[PDB]
Structure 1
Amino acid sequence: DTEKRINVGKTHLQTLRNLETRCHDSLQALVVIDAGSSSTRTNVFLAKTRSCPNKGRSIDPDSIQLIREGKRFTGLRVVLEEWLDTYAGKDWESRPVDARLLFQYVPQMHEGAKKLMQLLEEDTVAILDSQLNEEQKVQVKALGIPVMLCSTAGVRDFHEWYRDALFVLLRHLINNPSPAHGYKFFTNPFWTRPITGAEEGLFAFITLNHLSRRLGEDPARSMIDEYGVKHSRNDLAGVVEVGGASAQIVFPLQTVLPSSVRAVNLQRERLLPERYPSADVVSVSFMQLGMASSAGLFLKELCSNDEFLQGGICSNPCLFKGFQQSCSAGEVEVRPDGSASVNEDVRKNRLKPLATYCSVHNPEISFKVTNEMQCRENSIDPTKPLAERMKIENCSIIEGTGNFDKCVSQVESILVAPKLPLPANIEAASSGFESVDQVFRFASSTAPMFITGREMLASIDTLKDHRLLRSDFSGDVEELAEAAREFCSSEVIIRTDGPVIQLPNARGEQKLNSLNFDLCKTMALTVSLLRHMAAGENQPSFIKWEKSIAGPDGKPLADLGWQVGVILHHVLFTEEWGRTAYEAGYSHNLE
């Protein structure tokens, strides 16, 4: 009886001694501000930190889960372009501008950047407040919130010192948040910086392999041989990401490459720590190949060819029969009356970034003949004013012909395999790839491939839903080509409710919208991509089309992209992350 009372006091001391020796887990929020081409949005992630006595604090990589993707606010390009409109003067695209004079407008650039950053902060705080309990809130507010704002293809091709000067101001804005909310946001030049196309693709590869449990240092995901070399349990999968302004082609080598082809070793280029399995990965990004950028370039090139433009009417093989729109690369809206309204706004035009780059007043064109010839091949005249550059000369209406085979051959000659490389692709040319066709002709791998992108997935899904493609579909090009050939030959009939796409041989029907009208262009892109993938010396084990990867719970913990990759790129280097995130932390910003 009395011995049990003694044991209660002995347990009281043992339980208290455990706390002093054991590792305590705390919850920390991680913010990734996706400063894309179309928009600037915030991504709020949650992760479990582990503090051990004399061992420090480190994030559990498998605990990283996305809470919510924030509102789609103004893109960094628009921010910089309004600043130029207001300080360098309107129509600066058609006039020579002295960049030296624009230095007296840096506080003015800061005030404009403050507008966007206050909205992103307000949105980030809103996600945190609505999706965390009081206990979780205390933990999150005490540890501090590391912020990673990375610009992608939107300002990759941006001219002069402006882009890098804006980034210095952005970091200062993040490092000085509202003290009212309590959320301690902080950043540095390592976390908040413009990421290269290759970096964008490499982080997308890390994200894919992490979530799919292919990448890991534990014995469950990796094995050590007799020679101490760690190999991954399962084959590392490659990724194909087609965003708004750029397309990424990333795959690990499973291979002897030419001197011109410059592959990236994950451990040597400090992307993954030494403890993780080694892999030589080919990462390439192509500008003018994203959903918005390729749309403007395709319409410009196709409706300049005499084989398609006849009597002011451009015959588009990538658009459905019965569909017609105004001859411009402006934002297309499919109205309920069946009509397609083309936005007149110069900024809300899909050619704007290409026409702004392809300017004789930009030092990248006036000094570099190679780049000038690249622009001229895509019908863009850098000498002519901005309005004339985006203008489709001697064209009024675009008529849809619905010919898929003709749509493939055009996407091929224009976007996939052109005469010269597409403008602002020096990053791809430096690695040894002028175009998409060159990727597989110089570098090939048996590594499985994954296809990512809203419209890329929609292309395969639409054909699966209408029972044209099998539910169990591999990378069979002939199956995809025939299924899309039938779907793209559909007639558009303006029905009582609105515009409806009617499939041939009474197969089926669906409503025509501002997202699916030009899905056949994306379908042609997939065909030509799989064709070049099949042409390569080594072919991937399987090609998969997935929206998201399910975790252990069943629910996908995070979305595919560069977001998780950039977190892992910094968090996995234990010693380096511990110093910047916890030793320095938000306390570094104390004035």
Structure 2
Amino acid sequence: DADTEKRINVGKTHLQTLRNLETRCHDSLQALVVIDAGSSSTRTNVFLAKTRSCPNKGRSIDPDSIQLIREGKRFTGLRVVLEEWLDTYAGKDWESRPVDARLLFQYVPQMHEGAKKLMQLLEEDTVAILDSQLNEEQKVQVKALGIPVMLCSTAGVRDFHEWYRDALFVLLRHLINNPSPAHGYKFFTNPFWTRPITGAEEGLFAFITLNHLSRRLGEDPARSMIDEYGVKHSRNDLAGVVEVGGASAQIVFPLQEGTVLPSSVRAVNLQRERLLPERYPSADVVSVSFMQLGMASSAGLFLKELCSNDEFLQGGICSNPCLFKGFQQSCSAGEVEVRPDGSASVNEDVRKNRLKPLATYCSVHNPEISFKVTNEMQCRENSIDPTKPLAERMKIENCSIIEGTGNFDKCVSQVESILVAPKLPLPANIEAASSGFESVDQVFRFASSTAPMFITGREMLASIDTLKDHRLLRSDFSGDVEELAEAAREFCSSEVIIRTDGPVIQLPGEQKLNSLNFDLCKTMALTVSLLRHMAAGENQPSFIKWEKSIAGPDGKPLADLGWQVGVILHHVLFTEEWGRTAYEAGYSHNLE
């Protein structure tokens, strides 16, 4: 009788288990792809998120479950793809000749083949990442749901003349929407996901990534709070970001208490401008991006302006204060390779020349110069003559060899007058000027916040880490200007000794000289000048932090800092709109 009544409950549980399955929510794994089509390269970023489907509630993504599985190989940039197409279909050296844009329309199928070659590489790489990281059970869930692809171009093609860029984006979307059926991964896109993103957007998404990963941004009671007047506020202060890329630099910070700004200065409300949903806590954010401020673009422009000044150029010898004592290189903006024998190899290839994007923009044949006098004077003040041919524009006139003086104070003074606070704004910065900021100094002058700042960038971090490693800066570094300027002054004024082990930076410790650290003093001066303006502003940040990636709750980092996670959250957090485009329409939309 005991085992008879026991069997009855087993069958009762059997129905209850089945009844629970049909009423509860079911979690499935989904892959998300963000293709960073930057200045330096075009690379894939494979993410994984947990989807939850509930009866009568549809399917949604858990924002906290969003984690990067791998950032793919660095393939050819969109600028190179478009420039190669113009080299073969508009003739070689089109930069110095007047080109009829109307005639290029007959070469659209040929642009499709150029883009196809790059897209096939990115597709092959994405599949290789998914196949290596996902198990058979995970692969089935990933393949069934479809893979939303978001290809966003940044500073690389931001300044690109005529139609070309926008026409390429129409072709890029068709290539994503038509993937290889062999792999099984259902990649799909739309003009809302795959599109060129603005400098403000690039900065705003980078802000969303930082606050999401650091658990400062959220709509739950753990990260937010509803006051007695029904307004949602975040429990922790929202942090701002400074991202220094290859071609552009972004300065992003939220305004505390809604500080009164001038009419010319334009701040962006995250809810009002549809960046974050209404359920999220509101914030008015200042987001500005500066062209010719990124690692490579600033490096080329600085050499052009410094070696054009009579104070630094004497008898074909340009004295650079941002380069170490004893360092010698050719007078060009071309990529510098520090060879094992101490010598500096300067590649004079047009594609590899750091001035190239600026000299291509600064052309009398580009409608932004021929019709707009303001843009012509912006080029001419930075020594680029738009009338002159491409080679003559990139060439540092009456200069043969660049010698390193190692004076840090003189380097700060020059980074300030050229890059940070110039007379006229740096070329291709109409977006920044329309926000009310002609230059970096104007940012903290007109808009200031008591919100903590996060400095992001390979060289930005390297500048601080190098000084920390040699015991020039404390392990705990709040972001003191004088403390940094004293440490860098002692480091930049150190002799280069060519020894057996190669070129060594001799300090009263020692570090080897390479292609990444040879000009780090320009970035050290940039950090000093940047922190000087932050300390000059009416409102000062609570703390300044230098970070590569944010550590997750388990200890391991969830994702890397940048606009990647921000662009995902910009789409996924709008529950109804995401469900209609990613799940209702889906990959099935592409079917014939």
TM-score range, shorter chain: over 0.9
Mapping 1:474-489, distance limit 5 Å: 474-489=478-493
Measured in 1, the distance between the counterparts of 2:217 and 2:75 equals 33
| Deviation (angstroms), 1:122 | 0.5
Alignment deviations for residues 437-460 of structure 1 (CA, whole Å, 9 cap, x no partner):
000000000011000000000000
Displacement of 1:392 in angstroms is 0.1
The alignment partner of 1:122 has SS state of helix
How far off is 1:483 after superposition?
Answer: 0.1
Residue 227 of structure 1, CA deviation: 1.0
Structure 2 CA distance, aligned partners of 1:217 and 1:163? 37
Residues 221-258 of structure 1, C-alpha deviation per residue, up to 9 Å, x if partnerless? 00001111000000000000000000000000000000
- Listed one character per residue, the Cα deviations across residues 281-336 of structure 1 (whole Å, up to 9, x for unaligned) are 00000000000000000000000001111010000000000111110000100111
Cα-to-partner distance string for 1:499-537 (whole Å, 9 max, x where unaligned): 111113xxx011111100000000000000000000000
Query: Match of 2:573?
Result: 572
- Equivalent-residue separation in structure 2 for 1:547 and 1:87 (angstroms): 42
CA drift at 1:39: 0.2
Match of 1:441 among 442, 445, 459: 445
Mapped to 2, the partners of 1:463 and 1:347 lie a distance apart of 33
1:159-209 Cα distance to aligned partner (Å, 9 max, x none): 000000000000000000001100000000000000000000000000000
Q: Report the 3-state secondary structure (helix = DSSP H, G, I; strand = E; otherwise coil) of the residue aligned with 1:57.
A: strand
| Distance (Å, rounded) in 2 between the aligned partners of 1:247 and 1:561 | 12
The C-alpha deviation readout for 1:358-377, integer Å capped at 9, x for no partner, is: 00000000000110000000
Task: Name the counterpart of 2:278.
Answer: 274
Partner of 1:191: 193
SS of 2:242's equivalent?
Answer: strand
Q: CA deviation at 1:118?
A: 0.3
* 1:140-179 alignment, distance < 5 Å: 140-179=142-181
Question: What residue number does 2:555 align with?
Answer: 554
Deviation of 1:31 after TM superposition, in Å, equals: 0.3
Report the alpha carbon displacement of residue 105 of structure 1 after superposing the two structures with TM. Answer: 0.3
Tell me how far apart the structure 1 counterparts of residues 565 and 512 of structure 2 sit (CA, whole Å): 35
CA distance in 1, matches of 2:254, 2:5: 64
Distance, in Å, in 1 between the alignment partners of 2:168 and 2:19 is 52
Q: Is 2:391 aligned against 1:390? A: no
For residue 565 of structure 1, report the CA deviation from its aligned partner: 0.1
Counterpart position of 2:214: 212
CA positional deviation for 1:29? 0.3
- Superposition CA RMSD, Å: 0.5
Question: What is the DSSP-based 3-state SS (H/G/I as helix, E as strand, rest coil) of the residue aligned with 1:19?
Answer: helix
What is the rounded CA distance, in whole Å, between the counterparts of 2:466 and 2:31 in structure 1? 37
For 2:139 and 2:349, the matched residues in 1 are separated by: 43
1:498 Cα deviation from its structure 2 partner: 1.1
Query: SS of the residue aligned with 1:373?
Result: helix
Cα deviation for residue 5 of structure 1 reads: 1.2
Structure 1: distance between partners of 2:469 and 2:8: 70
Give me the whole-angstrom Cα distance separating, in 2, the residues matched to 1:409 and 1:344: 29
| In structure 2, distance between residues paired with 1:59 and 1:503 | 52
**Residue deviations 1:5-50 (CA, integer Å, cap 9, x gap):** 1111111100010000010000000000000000000000000000
CA–CA distance in 1 between the matches of 2:517 and 2:242? 21
Match in the other structure for 2:41: 39
Task: String of CA shifts for 1:421-474, please: whole Å, max 9, x gaps.
Answer: 000000000000000000000000001100000000000000000000001111
Q: What is the distance in 1 between the residues matched to 2:554 and 2:187?
A: 30
Distance 1:350 1:523 in 2: 20
What is the Cα deviation at residue 67 of structure 1? 0.3
Partner Cα separation in structure 2 for residue 59 and residue 71 of structure 1: 27
Does 1:363 find its partner at 2:367?
yes
Q: Distance in 1 between matches of 2:323 and 2:487?
A: 16
- Cα distance in 1 for partners of 2:389, 2:372 equals 19
Partner SS state of residue 191, structure 1: coil
Which residue of structure 1 aligns with residue 98 of structure 2? 96
Give distance in 1, aligned partners of 2:469 and 2:549: 18
Match of 1:304 among 303, 308, 320: 308
Gaps of 5+ in 2: none
1:320 is paired with a residue whose SS is coil
Q: TM-score, normalised by structure 2?
A: 0.99
1:475 Cα offset (Å): 1.5
The corresponding residue for 1:228 is: 230
Deviations 1:33-84 (A, max 9, x none): 0000000000000000000011000000000000000000000000000000
| Distance (whole Å) between structure 2 residues aligned to residue 142 and residue 491 of structure 1 | 61
Q: Secondary structure of the residue that 1:388 maps to in structure 2?
A: helix
Q: How far, CA to CA, are the matches of 1:125 and 1:514 in structure 2?
A: 33
C-alpha distance in 2 between matches for 1:552 and 1:529: 32
How many Å separate the matches in 2 of 1:131 and 1:340? 41
Q: Which runs of 4+ in 1 moved over 6 A?
A: none
Alpha-carbon distance between aligned partners in 2 of 1:503 and 1:382, rounded to the nearest angstrom? 43
Equivalent position of 1:16 in the other structure? 18
Matches within 5 A, 1:312-331: 312-331=316-335
Q: Secondary structure at the match of 1:440?
A: helix
CA distance in 2, matches of 1:3, 1:216: 50
SS of equivalent residue, structure 1 residue 8: helix
Shift of residue 497, structure 1, vs aligned partner: 1.6
- 1:363-413 CA deviation, whole Å, 9 max, x = no partner? 000000110000000000000000000000010110000000000000000
Deviation at 1:477, TM superposition (A): 0.3
Other structure's SS at 1:493 match: strand
In structure 2, what is the Cα distance between the partners aligned to 1:459 and 1:573?
Answer: 39
Counterpart Cα distance in 2 of 1:468 and 1:370: 44
- Which among 49, 59, 62 is matched to residue 60 of structure 1? 62
Counterpart of 2:108 in 1: which secondary structure? Answer: helix
Q: How do 1:438-477 residues align onto structure 2 when only pairs under 5 Å count?
A: 438-477=442-481
2:409 aligned to which of 386, 397, 405: 405
Q: What TM-score results when the alignment is normalised by the length of structure 1?
A: 0.99
Quote how far apart the aligned CAs of 1:146 are: 0.2
Q: CA deviation at 1:2?
A: 2.1
**2: distance between equivalents of 1:487 and 1:3?**
83
SS of 2:261's equivalent in the other structure is: coil
Aligned-partner SS, 2:150: strand
Pick the aligned partner of 2:347 from 343, 347, 351: 343
Q: Separation in 1 of the partners of 2:185 and 2:504?
A: 48
Q: Aligned partners of 2:360 and 2:564: how far apart in 1?
A: 28
Q: CA–CA distance in 2 between the matches of 1:319 and 1:462?
A: 16
- CA–CA separation in structure 1 for the residues paired with 2:522 and 2:151: 32
